[PDB]
Amino acid sequence: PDPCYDEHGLPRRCIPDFVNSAFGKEVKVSSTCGKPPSRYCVVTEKGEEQVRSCHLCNASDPKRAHPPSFLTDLNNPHNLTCWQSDSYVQYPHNVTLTLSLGKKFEVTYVSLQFCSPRPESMAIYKSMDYGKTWVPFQFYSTQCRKMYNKPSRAAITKQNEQEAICTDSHTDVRPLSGGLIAFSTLDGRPTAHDFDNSPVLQDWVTATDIKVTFSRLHTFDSYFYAVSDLQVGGRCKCNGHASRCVRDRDDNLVCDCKHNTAGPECDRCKPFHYDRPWQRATAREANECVACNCNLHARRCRFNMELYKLSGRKSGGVCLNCRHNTAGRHCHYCKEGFYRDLSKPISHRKACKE
Ligand SMILES: *[C@@H]1O[C@H](CO)[C@@H](O)[C@H](O)[C@H]1NC(C)=O
Ligand SMILES: *[C@@H]1O[C@H](CO)[C@@H](O)[C@H](O)[C@H]1NC(C)=O
């Protein structure tokens, strides 16, 4: 029931299913305690009092290790899975964790649940080029102006709708453990209520990797970073041209591009279906790609923009190499010297006789 087409076969927008993409994926952390085994300490406030409690981190005897998988795994609110770096780690040392998504994804949110008090200075970066460069996604720092040099909670008007602003809420110690930091990408952008026609916010959510630079916790002799469950929610960027993604031959995640579009993200038109410039599948117009018209006399075609504009943005469909002794934009008329045969249709393999 491919919903990427409606009842009577018409193309209509379709986007995949919202998932915990983080779920089950590997995180390349910058620190995991246990080797060599080491000392850490946890505060447990009971009433007025503060119960200092210290246990050891040893990797090669597993139960007291803290691997990256605790993050993206089944989190169950009893058996809670807190990853934990090497304790005693400070400023100005980029505790950079890096996740590899696997395909262009338009991210709704990024949420972290801390077992240690929510750090003071962290920052969400993002990579749209698949781990080649990085950019400020959103900052957290009770001292924003110094640390990340950004203004503390910058305002987002029509001119910086892609500047990561820098906040300081939920950067608070309490609760010691359990502090969840839920960042919404599109949150606070003046044109969020029209993402279908906001190509810039469509670029603000376009992400391929995520980097997290912890620079500083709070100033409480052990102290560390521990996180329980990590979720990167979002759908698969198919430009509204596929309602599900799948990995292919040599295992690489690409869309199920419909609408005669081509590409991993459907960004372009499949060969021959260049009759209309690829556009974004929005709320009402699939803006699908369309096969040219050659009357079955050709196999390839380009796209002429005058003929689009000069037609009034209708079709730039120009056939390449009309076979079967025809010619013309739509192979719609015989070659020179070959007369047309009224007994045979234009699409015949001998519609044109000598
Ligand atoms: C966690 O898993 C172990 C499995 O042996 C179980 O004993 C324990 O009760 C579970 N949950 C908690 C809250 O300890
Ligand atoms: C820390 O930041 C510096 C900035 O020059 C960079 O070169 C380095 O790779 C970063 N290190 C880590 C561990 O992220």
- Our count of domains for the chain comes to 1
CATH of the domain at 210: 2.60.120.260
Q: Which ligand is nearest to the CA of 79?
A: 1
Atom of ligand 2 nearest to the CA of 211: 14
- Residues 347 and 32: their CA atoms lie apart, in Å, by 68
190 in Cβ contact with 156 (< 8 Å): yes
Tell me the resolution in Å: 3.9
- Residue nearest (by alpha carbon) to ligand 1 atom 6: 79
Q: What is the DSSP letter of 274?
A: B
Helix (H) or strand (E) holding 347: none
Give just the sign of the alpha carbon dihedral 15, 300, 248, 2.
positive
Give just the sign of the alpha carbon dihedral 114, 120, 126, 130.
negative
Q: Which residues line ligand 1 (CB under 6 A)?
A: 78-79
96 lines ligand 2 (CB under 6 A): yes
Q: What are phi and psi of 319, to 5 degrees?
A: -65, 145
**Which residues are CB-contacts of 290 (< 8 A; sequence separation ≥ 6)?**
260, 273, 275, 276, 317
Is position 279 within any domain? no
- Residue nearest (by alpha carbon) to ligand 2 atom 9: 94
**Cis peptide, bond prior to residue 92, ω within 30 of zero:** yes
Per DSSP, the residues of 133-201 read: --EEEEEEESSHHHHS-S-BT----TT-TT---EE-TT-S--SSS-EEEEEESSTT-TTGGG-TT-TTH
Atom of ligand 2 nearest to the CA of 30: 13
In the chain, what is the straight-line distance between the N-terminal and C-terminal CA atoms, in Å? Answer: 48
What is the CA(69)–ligand 2 centre distance, in A?
24
Q: Which of 63, 74, 79 to mutate to test the pocket of ligand 1 (most atoms within 8 A of CB)?
A: 79
- Three-state DSSP class for residue 62: helix
How far is residue 106 CA from its own chain's centroid? Answer: 4
Q: Which of 78, 80, 115, 177 to mutate to test the pocket of ligand 1 (most atoms within 8 A of CB)?
A: 78
30 lines ligand 2 (CB under 6 A): yes
What is the CA(93)–ligand 2 centre distance, in A?
8
Is position 92 within any domain? yes
What is the CA(111)–ligand 1 centre distance, in A?
25
Is position 347 within any domain? no
Q: Which of 31, 91, 93, 94 to mutate to test the pocket of ligand 2 (most atoms within 8 A of CB)?
A: 94
* 143's tokens: 């001292």
What is the CA(122)–ligand 1 centre distance, in A?
32
Is position 205 within any domain? yes
- Residues 265 and 346: their CA atoms lie apart, in Å, by 37
240 in Cβ contact with 286 (< 8 Å): yes
Is position 181 within any domain? yes
| Domain extent for 131 | 19-236
Burial of 243-270, coded b for 16+ CB within 10 Å and e otherwise, reads: bebeeeeeeeebbbbbbbbbbbbbbbbb
- Residues 311 and 314: their CA atoms lie apart, in Å, by 6
Per DSSP, the residues of 200-226 read: THHHHSEEEEEEEEE-B---------E
Is position 142 within any domain? yes
**Cis peptide, bond prior to residue 151, ω within 30 of zero:** no
**Which residues are CB-contacts of 192 (< 8 A; sequence separation ≥ 6)?**
186, 198, 201
Is position 318 within any domain? no
- Count of CB atoms situated within 10 Å of the CB of 80: 14
27 in Cβ contact with 68 (< 8 Å): yes
Is position 137 within any domain? yes
**Cis peptide, bond prior to residue 36, ω within 30 of zero:** yes
